[PDB]
């Protein structure tokens, strides 16, 4: 394939037990590679990470109500997948598709996700350039500079990690068309 | 121009110097803050602090750091300082509270997520004034690299030294993108 292109992009999204990685942990991870024009080249290996029920039945109330209602809390018990499992097979996918230190990490408020990857999945982190490509930076500029662009952005729920990433890419495509001057 | 003070669309820009890349071990050496309106006009420049650190600290930071902070006399300003981080945090919080409502402004700058790591560990009271989002000018840099690299000729790079001048640099970079890369 024309994979390994220097300008290819790694997008990802995590679900977690909450906002503070000091104590909280990673529940689900997904990965999409695009070319630089945002064409999805590959959906990588999705993972629920297995944790116990003392972990799962002691989140914040935002997390019990929404990981329950999406069937993720239940998928975590089902899984017998480790973090070092997810890590090795995430970094694997990503070595095929793009080089090393080339792509930033891409998604909405991707810095928050990066806090968890840094602590818990360092080997995966080291493949990335140190920069983020945070689509919410663009959303914050559009709010102030051209707010009506946001009518064309699509918000369809929350869902799995996978469809969240696709919402992020799609959000950026809208910007590419209506907000950037290429 | 206190006219614009309190406007919900104001942006908080900052830059930090640290003793390295890893907040687990490293500490903050300097903080500078600039407030702009949503159209990037500078409304107010914040008190600049070199944070007091002992000689133990200054003399054993990584070699990049003794090199460049040595180079710039930040190291020296840090030895001269009696300014505690608590103090800087208190001053900085009061300053931003004057210019923008709580929860409104993302944190703004180049690779600003990195700074927010140290802000979050060491100055959580100041972090609470910000919206949870970042406005990261280097995101736009990475888009420009791929979609319209020629805009980057118009971005002005220049020297570190001041944390204030690193910030004015980011603002200026975004002004450039505003003009050449965004439709608006
Ligand atoms: C919003 C939110 C998120 N989280 C954690 C748990 C999640 O695994 C993770 C992010 O999930 P997300 O689905 O991206 O969170 C959001 C869901 C909806 C919206 N929104 O469009 O109103 C924004 C963020 O961060 C929390 O712990 N509490 C919260 O209030
Ligand atoms: C409410 C809240 C949320 N978060 C993180 C966890 C969420 O995953 C993230 C939400 O990011 P965003 O910039 O508000 O919003 C989006 C997420 C996804 C999409 N999308 O187009 O798939 C759009 C916006 O924000 C925080 O880090 N702190 C918070 O207080
Ligand atoms: C680049 C770099 C940074 N750091 C730590 C100490 C610094 O105080 C802190 C902040 O980085 P910075 O002082 O703002 O340095 C740079 C700013 C912009 C650019 N640039 O030209 O893209 C390079 C460095 O990060 C290091 O410890 N080593 C480094 O090589
Ligand atoms: C090499 C390296 C650098 N950094 C930090 C050091 C700096 O604090 C920060 C600089 O990020 P950037 O995206 O390269 O920053 C810029 C700052 C100002 C301007 N400008 O011309 O206005 C451009 C880029 O990135 C890291 O966080 N990790 C690293 O491994």
Residue numbers in the entry:
A (entry chain B): 0 to 181
B (entry chain A): -2 to 181
Q: What's in the article?
A:
Therefore, oligoribonucleases (ORN), RNases targeted toward short oligonucleotides, are needed for the complete digestion of short oligonucleotides into mononucleotides. Among these, ORN belongs to the DEDD superfamily, comprising 3′-5′ exonucleases that require a divalent cation for activity. Our research group have focused on the mechanism of action of oligoribonuclease (CpsORN) from the psychrophilic gram-negative bacterium Colwellia psychrerythraea strain 34H, to understand how the enzyme hydrolyses small nucleic acids. Structural analysis results show that CpsORN is a stable dimer and its active site is formed by swapping residues from the other subunit.
The putative active site of CpsORN was confirmed by solving the structure of the pNP-TMP-bound CpsORN (D163A inactive mutant). The pNP-TMP complexed D163A mutant CpsORN crystal contains two pNP-TMP molecules in the active site of each monomer, but no metal ion was found at the expected position of the magnesium ion. This is consistent with the fact that the D163A mutant has no RNase activity, and bound pNP-TMP is not cleaved in pNP-TMP complexed CpsORN structure. Structural alignment between the unliganded form and the pNP-TMP-bound D163A mutant structure of CpsORN has 0.503 Å overall r.m.s deviation for 159 Cα atoms. The major structural differences were found in the α2 helix and the α8-α9 loop region near the active site, suggesting that ligand-binding induces these conformational changes. Detailed examination revealed that the side chain of Trp61, located on the α2 helix is flipped, and extends to the active site. This change leads to the shift of the α2 helix toward the active site. The α8-α9 loop region also shifts slightly toward the active site and interacts with the bound pNP-TMP. These conformational changes generate the closed state of pNP-TMP-bound CpsORN compared to the unliganded form of CpsORN.
